[PDB]
Enzyme design. Structure first.
Site, PDB file in Angstrom:
ATOM      1  N   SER A 145       0.845  -1.196   0.000  1.00  0.00           N
ATOM      2  CA  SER A 145       0.000   0.000   0.000  1.00  0.00           C
ATOM      3  C   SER A 145       0.881   1.247   0.000  1.00  0.00           C
ATOM      4  O   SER A 145       1.730   1.389  -0.886  1.00  0.00           O
ATOM      5  CB  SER A 145      -0.973  -0.021   1.186  1.00  0.00           C
ATOM      6  OG  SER A 145      -1.756  -1.220   1.183  1.00  0.00           O
ATOM      7  N   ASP A 242      -7.923  -2.576  -7.866  1.00  0.00           N
ATOM      8  CA  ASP A 242      -7.518  -2.353  -6.483  1.00  0.00           C
ATOM      9  C   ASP A 242      -8.543  -1.496  -5.739  1.00  0.00           C
ATOM     10  O   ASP A 242      -9.023  -0.486  -6.257  1.00  0.00           O
ATOM     11  CB  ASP A 242      -6.142  -1.688  -6.474  1.00  0.00           C
ATOM     12  CG  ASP A 242      -5.619  -1.454  -5.085  1.00  0.00           C
ATOM     13  OD1 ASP A 242      -4.915  -2.326  -4.570  1.00  0.00           O
ATOM     14  OD2 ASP A 242      -5.932  -0.399  -4.505  1.00  0.00           O
ATOM     15  N   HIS A 288      -8.332  -5.475  -1.516  1.00  0.00           N
ATOM     16  CA  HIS A 288      -7.313  -4.738  -0.775  1.00  0.00           C
ATOM     17  C   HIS A 288      -6.354  -5.664  -0.027  1.00  0.00           C
ATOM     18  O   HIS A 288      -5.600  -5.185   0.823  1.00  0.00           O
ATOM     19  CB  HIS A 288      -7.968  -3.761   0.215  1.00  0.00           C
ATOM     20  CG  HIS A 288      -8.793  -4.427   1.277  1.00  0.00           C
ATOM     21  ND1 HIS A 288     -10.170  -4.340   1.315  1.00  0.00           N
ATOM     22  CD2 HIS A 288      -8.436  -5.184   2.343  1.00  0.00           C
ATOM     23  CE1 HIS A 288     -10.625  -5.019   2.353  1.00  0.00           C
ATOM     24  NE2 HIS A 288      -9.594  -5.541   2.995  1.00  0.00           N
TER      25      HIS A 288
HETATM   26  C1  LIG Z   1      -0.919   6.350  -0.030  1.00  0.00           C
HETATM   27  N1  LIG Z   1      -1.959   5.575  -0.719  1.00  0.00           N
HETATM   28  N2  LIG Z   1      -2.283   4.284  -0.398  1.00  0.00           N
HETATM   29  C2  LIG Z   1      -3.254   3.859  -1.194  1.00  0.00           C
HETATM   30  C3  LIG Z   1      -3.572   4.899  -2.052  1.00  0.00           C
HETATM   31 CL1  LIG Z   1      -4.799   4.928  -3.354  1.00  0.00          CL
HETATM   32  C4  LIG Z   1      -2.739   5.964  -1.730  1.00  0.00           C
HETATM   33  C5  LIG Z   1      -2.835   7.306  -2.493  1.00  0.00           C
HETATM   34  O1  LIG Z   1      -3.901   7.800  -2.671  1.00  0.00           O
HETATM   35  N3  LIG Z   1      -1.677   8.010  -3.032  1.00  0.00           N
HETATM   36  C6  LIG Z   1      -1.808   9.275  -3.787  1.00  0.00           C
HETATM   37  C7  LIG Z   1      -1.613   8.937  -5.257  1.00  0.00           C
HETATM   38  C8  LIG Z   1      -0.693   7.802  -5.522  1.00  0.00           C
HETATM   39  C9  LIG Z   1       0.218   7.344  -4.447  1.00  0.00           C
HETATM   40  C10 LIG Z   1      -0.231   7.633  -3.019  1.00  0.00           C
END
Ligand SMILES: Cn1ncc(Cl)c1C(=O)N1CCCCC1
Ligand SMILES: *[C@@H]1O[C@H](CO)[C@@H](O)[C@H](O)[C@H]1NC(C)=O
Length: 342
Positions: A145, A242, A288
């Site tokens: 993640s 995802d 997830h």
């Molecule tokens: C931190 N994270 N975990 C799951 C998701 Cl989805 C995110 C997220 O939104 N971002 C912003 C855009 C791309 C990288 C980080």
């Protein structure tokens, strides 16, 4: 069980100034080291970080961490649970910097919080060299993640750090699980990361920074943009549908025509971004679930499990007959692969 060690350099801290740390289980008959980055979203301003400190404080502080943790999935030492690397030296690095592992800023008179994720990784590495990592053959930096995005942002910096410290023989590799996202159109994020980077003093890989240049560093948080700039070998694990991607896209699963087309287009776009990624595992599932779950062995793409694909990747870094490493589903709807998590 993995045992907690708080960093001996106590100026490398979680958000609230408490010391960061790592959980360690040594395997003294092994020269393989697995360093795993925890995930857990992020926060990007004072008010948003204050809320996280009230109800997600373990992701901002070591004050309440337990003395031990149990290794599961790819962090398990049991061969039945972990056919890939059960005999490795195992390290779990808690996520307590809320910066997608990018930050390099301390608390100060002007900063309510410390965002030190990039320095936490470097300090864990440095302190582990005196505990046996100096004899390693392979250092696999893995994460799920936000930790999987953290792998993409930090794997080449770890390689550079070991080279500069005088350990050129350790082979640094990356495994990014569920951290490969698209900056696509919503059905009904780049702004929040843009503000976060300024709030954190966030840092990105230098080759990617030189492409996108000042103010555009947010691009390097997207796997398909940062991956071609990396020199270390990186294996990518990403569900085609995802659940975190769909959440930021404002999709929450009787699907009618517009939503059907949106979901199918998302799967095809994800597939396209992995075409030139030779080591990858991308099942057609809505999930997830991550690689530290105990039943991570169950999913297969084209008849090959992820532990097998990772072992084939090891062999390729010494195509192989019967041992594939590029495994991307081609069917177009969640759970068209029968082995998807239930
Ligand atoms: C931190 N994270 N975990 C799951 C998701 Cl989805 C995110 C997220 O939104 N971002 C912003 C855009 C791309 C990288 C980080
Ligand atoms: C501890 O870490 C900080 C931040 O990375 C660094 O500035 C300092 O030099 C370190 N101290 C020692 C003794 O290594």
């Amino acid at each position: 069980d993995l045992r907690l060690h708080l960093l001996l350099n106590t100026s490398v801290t979680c958000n609230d100034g408490s010391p960061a740390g790592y959980y360690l289980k040594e395997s003294r008959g092994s020269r393989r080291w697995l360093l795993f980055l925890e995930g857990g979203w992020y926060c990007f301003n004072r008010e948003n970080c204050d809320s996280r400190y009230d109800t997600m404080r373990r992701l901002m502080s070591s004050r309440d961490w337990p003395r031990t943790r149990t290794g599961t999935g790819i962090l398990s030492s049991q061969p039945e649970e972990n056919p890939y690397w059960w005999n490795a030296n195992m390290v779990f690095i808690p996520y307590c910097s809320s910066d997608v592992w990018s930050g390099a800023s301390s608390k100060s008179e002007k900063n309510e919080y410390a965002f030190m994720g990039a320095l936490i990784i470097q300090e864990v590495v440095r302190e582990l060299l005196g505990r046996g990592l100096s004899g390693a053959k392979v250092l696999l930096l893995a994460g799920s993640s936000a930790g999987g995005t953290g792998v993409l942002l930090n794997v080449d910096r770890v390689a550079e750090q070991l080279e500069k410290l005088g350990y050129p023989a350790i082979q640094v590799r990356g495994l990014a699980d569920s951290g490969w996202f698209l900056d696509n159109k919503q059905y009904r994020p780049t702004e929040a990361i843009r503000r976060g980077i300024r709030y954190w003093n966030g840092v990105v890989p230098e080759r990617c920074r030189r492409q996108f240049q000042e103010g555009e560093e947010w691009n390097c948080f997207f796997g398909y943009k940062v991956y071609p700039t990396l020199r270390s070998p990186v294996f990518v694990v990403q569900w085609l549908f995802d659940e975190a991607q769909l959440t930021v896209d404002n999709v929450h699963l009787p699907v009618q025509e517009g939503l059907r087309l949106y979901i199918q287009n998302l799967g095809r776009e994800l597939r396209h971004t992995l075409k030139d990624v030779p080591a990858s595992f991308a099942p057609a599932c809505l999930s997830h679930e991550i690689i530290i779950r105990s039943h991570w062995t169950d999913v297969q793409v084209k008849g090959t499990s992820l532990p097998r694909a990772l072992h084939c990747w090891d062999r390729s870094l010494h195509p192989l007959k019967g041992c594939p490493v590029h495994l991307v589903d081609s069917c177009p709807w969640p759970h068209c692969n029968p082995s998807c998590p239930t």
